[PDB]
Amino acid sequence: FEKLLRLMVEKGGSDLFITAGVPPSMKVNGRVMPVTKTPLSPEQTRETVLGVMNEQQRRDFAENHECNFAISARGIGRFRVSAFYQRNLVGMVLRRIETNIPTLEELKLPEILKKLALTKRGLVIFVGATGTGKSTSLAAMIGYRNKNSTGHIISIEDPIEYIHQHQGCIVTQREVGLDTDSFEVALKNTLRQAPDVIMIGEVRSRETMDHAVAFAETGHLCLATLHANNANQALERIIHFFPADRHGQVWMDLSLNLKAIVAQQLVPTPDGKGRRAVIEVLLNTPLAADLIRKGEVHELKPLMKRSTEQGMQTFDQALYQLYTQGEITYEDALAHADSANDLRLMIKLG
Amino acid sequence: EFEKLLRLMVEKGGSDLFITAGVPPSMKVNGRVMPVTKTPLSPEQTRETVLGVMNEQQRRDFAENHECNFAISARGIGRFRVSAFYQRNLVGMVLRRIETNIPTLEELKLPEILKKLALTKRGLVIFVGATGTGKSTSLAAMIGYRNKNSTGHIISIEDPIEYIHQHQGCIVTQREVGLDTDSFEVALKNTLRQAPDVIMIGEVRSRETMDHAVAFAETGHLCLATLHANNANQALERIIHFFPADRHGQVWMDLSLNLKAIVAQQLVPTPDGKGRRAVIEVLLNTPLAADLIRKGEVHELKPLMKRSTEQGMQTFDQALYQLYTQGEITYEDALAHADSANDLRLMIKL
Amino acid sequence: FEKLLRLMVEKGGSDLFITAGVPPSMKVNGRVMPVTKTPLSPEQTRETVLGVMNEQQRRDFAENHECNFAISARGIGRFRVSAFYQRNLVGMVLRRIETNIPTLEELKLPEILKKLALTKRGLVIFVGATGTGKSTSLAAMIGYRNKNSTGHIISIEDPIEYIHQHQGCIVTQREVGLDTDSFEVALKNTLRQAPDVIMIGEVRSRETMDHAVAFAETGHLCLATLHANNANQALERIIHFFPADRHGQVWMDLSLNLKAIVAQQLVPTPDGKGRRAVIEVLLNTPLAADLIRKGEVHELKPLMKRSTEQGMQTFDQALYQLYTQGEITYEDALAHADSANDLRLMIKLG
């Protein structure tokens, strides 16, 4: 089993497949390819899947017919497993935890992210739908701060998607369910670990939101991801974490400590061989803070269209900057625009 | 060995010591993480060093909960608080040095109005300021003044405890959240039944903490607390936002009735660049100030503080004016730190 | 240990202090004074604090780091204890349960309370902030009915603040957590114990409110305390105990059985050596009952200003009656008034 893991790391496989009826196959560059010539038997698949679990994980797997966990192989790396029943037979899919962190330039992200990465204190939020590259761009941005500054970075992820090696800053990566019992317990102790930047993998409850706000008030850089399309809907979801009586405080605290909200979309390139990351940037200018303090989240979209000199940009302005660069077609810009008539008016204007 | 690393931190004045795998033993001296040795720590050495500080029971809680926060006492060196944690399935710990020497108000060169406030019998005193402006340092110095100049019981609820005051004229009960109490709210709820004469809340972060502080002052006890806000006006704005708008009318009335003073603190560098001086903005609850508080006219506070310097009040511009005339700050540092660079330039020229 | 309790009762100490680092000290007349000459060791403090708990209280104290309970010493009296961890060391504060009940005249309460104390059936509610003397004035009023009538008084408190000796009425004092499992269980059995007056220590839930309403319908005198500033806000909190569909019944039941709502404030005397109890009285006149039946709680404040002949009085009318008596200054009246302009108009009018 340990030999199959080294082959995946040496060959750069994205995912390993262990199920009955097919040989051990790995997805290398998106192509499922068999590793051996002999398919796995139901007994060998049941012996291989259960052999990776401990006594408690074997109990949860037999009761719930499913079990998702993570493992750490000494000297090889880490990988996330998704075990499952299939046709009343055991099966598991393993995903290698990547370590080669792309840079902000390799992702072709705007330069305002670099200034945000070197910020000393504040709250930065990565919004976007599922799989829009939020964690990918965040880890790329995390590598920028790790390489360009000195300090301590504390990470709480569920799961850890990228493992950053110790560069200029000390990097402590903790995964929920292995290194900590929950997000709340880790963030509660993150303050006493003398961090300089704290990255919450995802804010899913009000307790996670309170810790993120308290992190920024103490002069630390707080980063987190949340599932929302743009900056306006992200603020709407955050305020709904709290009862209405605490909204007045939430609007005031958000207007005081927030630094930026980065919304990310993935639009296909003209050649169809890849996807480009569209970034909507909202910087906390004094006018934006007043709109936040008043809860006038509706007034945010017009304000971002007039302050492009400070570093802000909507999705229509970012798509306008990418279509003029030739990185996206004309049809892809109008289909991905927040307003297909404004983007058509923005492109026709110059 | 380990005891030698503690003496080096005390002799070099390190704020925090870092013990984790992948990086050499590093200490945060003056906010800069610096390695102590040249050889990084191995996972076995980090696991042997972290577990070596725990007893048999702390090693059991650490293995079950993946986290363990505790405190230790080294004979002849001092005390330090540790925050152990799992990180990438590896052990790690951060140690924070606890300070036992409590300075005096004269050593901090604080205004004499603080001494009269320290000996007050009942009321609410609030320390405002940005992160690291010496709020807790000046408060502990003020706490040592009341502890040495009066008889009674002082109850302290901190997160964490930054200074440990020995029993002087008053009985000093220091309780830290997470070790001596489960939360700020639980400790303040029981603080009333412990017969205190002065109660110091480490920081007010919610409305429940604010309600207890108000109830503490109504019962004839001296209540002190810290909050993160630049000046007195913004501190009042943040406090009222803790509550829904329907309860604002009561909050303005209660604040106008029990409040004693609001002390805003700024740190300006001395002319020689070798240190920083604490600038103190003092707002005393005169009858005119109480009426402005009862009406919610927080905007009318800044002009009122400029005309009542005889009673003990002073703005940041008046305090910076008193320090620049003393030679404790340059002319450029006064205009850059002034709330109004034109008023301070007019105050100095007058 | 039993000798230290007798010394506190013989010397009239308000609170006894048992913590490491200081001798056993008692707060007599507000002055913390040491009893012995030798301070207590951590082992002696740990042996004294844990020695008062049973096996279960020692388990809750070790797990939660805090434990509040009550004890009964045969032949001495009762005292409430608040144990706590402090600097990872045990400590406890003991408060003596007072038995010398002040009378209504000693508290200088209005005579309408005497007529309310001798009432046969109905609901009387003591409102006020934390520590406004609600339980103190109630126990004083309880001693009036106990001494001036014959019957059975049933008390459910959490905790019992005053212990009334058997006078004209039979006095059964039950404390939650020692004499009963909960407020609901005690009130459920209070009906089958043939009472004539039932005092609920505090109404904190709807189940407690339902029992109080049912107590008054059965021809018994029901008294209870709740935390609210005045009569209007007390009614708002009571109706919010119930869903909106049951509000129509609650308004009708309140208009039918309620007798009075007594709001209490504590204003300092001119000499600054004490505090005087300000009492806002709202009597259930037919016009008030109609405003209650319609839910027009807003219409209550104007009605109380016009029916001073029946025994009602607002906070502004009571403060007007105390300022004319010389028991409060002119500045203390305008600062504590519900309307500083109406009280200024009430005082200027005569």
Numbering used by the authors:
A (entry chain D), C (entry chain D): 3 to 352
B (entry chain A): 2 to 351
Reproduce, without paraphrasing, sentences from the article in which this PDB structure was first reported:
Many functions of Pseudomonas aeruginosa type IVa pili, including twitching motility and surface sensing, depend on dynamic cycles of filament assembly and disassembly powered by the cytoplasmic ATPases PilB, PilT, and PilU. Addition of pilin subunits from their reservoir in the cytoplasmic membrane to the growing filament is powered by the extension ATPase PilB via the platform protein PilC, while extraction of subunits from assembled filaments back into the membrane during retraction requires the ATPase PilT. P. aeruginosa encodes a second retraction ATPase, PilU, whose function is not clearly defined. Single-cell imaging using iSCAT microscopy confirmed that pilU mutants grown in liquid retract their pili in a PilT-dependent manner, suggesting that while not essential for filament disassembly, PilU may be needed to generate additional force when pili are tethered to a surface and thus under higher loads.
To uncover the unique role of P. aeruginosa PilU, we first determined its crystal structure. The structure was determined at 4.5 Å resolution, with four protomers in the asymmetric unit. While the overall domain organization and distinctive C3 symmetric hexameric architecture were clearly resolved, individual side chains could not be confidently modeled and were therefore not included. Based on our previous definitions of packing unit interfaces formed by adjacent protomers, the PilU C3 hexamer has alternating open (O) and closed (C) subunits, mirroring the C3-symmetric OCOCOC conformation of Geobacter metallireducens PilT. The OCOCOC conformation of PilU has been identified in PilT structures, while the assembly ATPase PilB adopts a C2-symmetric CCOCCO conformation. PilB has two N-terminal domains (N1D and N2D) that interact with regulatory ligands, while PilT and PilU have only a single N-terminal domain. Sequence comparisons between PilU and species-matched PilT homologs revealed a striking divergence within the final 60 residues of the C-terminus. While the first 30 of these C-terminal PilU residues remain structurally conserved, the last 30—typically absent in PilT—are predicted to be disordered by ESpritz and were unresolved in the crystal structure. Structural predictions suggest that these residues extend outward rather than integrating into the hexameric core, and recent Alphafold modeling studies suggested that this segment of PilU may stabilize its interaction with PilT. Our X-ray crystal structure of PilU showed a typical PilT-like hexameric ATPase architecture, captured in a C3 OCOCOC configuration. These data support the conclusion that it is a motor protein that assists PilT in pilus retraction under high loads, a hypothesis supported by recent studies showing that while pilU mutants can retract their pili, they generate reduced retraction forces compared to wild-type cells.
